[PDB]
């Protein structure tokens with residue numbers, strides 16, 4: 001679908017726009033591809049991702065964090081942020097540099113908004129200067145404009161000692177195309 005998890009990377013809130021990058025050709029009810037976006041995360045911010053095949057290649061709808069990812073028994077999550085709680089190794093309730101999954105997590109920033117993730121568009125948490133993520137959030141259910149939404153918001157720490165927002169989003173999309181494709 002179009003449900004997502006994102007980080008505020010430059011420290012002024014998670015922000016979204018209408019799509020214009022790839023939108024000069026739109027997918028249709030028989031042409032296979034990715035579900036047609038009308039809005040997306042603006043390039044100062046990034047999506048939280050993981051290759052579930054461990055080679056650092058994002059291609060499937062579970063590889064985005066969001067309500068279409070699964071928990072450690074194979075169940076879908078009720079809220080995509082809570083799927084991060086399976087990844088804490090020691091039970092301190094932070095995702096930090098001592099957890100194995102900290103190296104497996106990545107962040108995606110797409111400048112062309114084509115819905116495919118390519119290798120230059122990805123960041124590891126250490127290359128992104130992240131030190132920890134909090135497994136704690138509040139429900140905010142806030143509009144972001146252009147049909148986009150922020151459901152829930154938590155927090156993260158940078159290696160430079162700055163702290164910033166992270167959260168669960170709904171991104172704007174074509175409703176019929178989002179039923180022809182997942």
Ligand SMILES: [Ca+2]
Pocket residue numbers: 008009010011012013014015044045
């Ligand atoms: Ca921002």
Ligand SMILES: [Ca+2]
Pocket residue numbers: 051052053057058059060063
């Ligand atoms: Ca994959």
Ligand SMILES: [Ca+2]
Pocket residue numbers: 003004066067079080151168169
């Ligand atoms: Ca959600």
Ligand SMILES: [Ca+2]
Pocket residue numbers: 088089090091092093094095096098099
């Ligand atoms: Ca931990």
Ligand SMILES: [Ca+2]
Pocket residue numbers: 110111112113114115116117118121
């Ligand atoms: Ca791309």
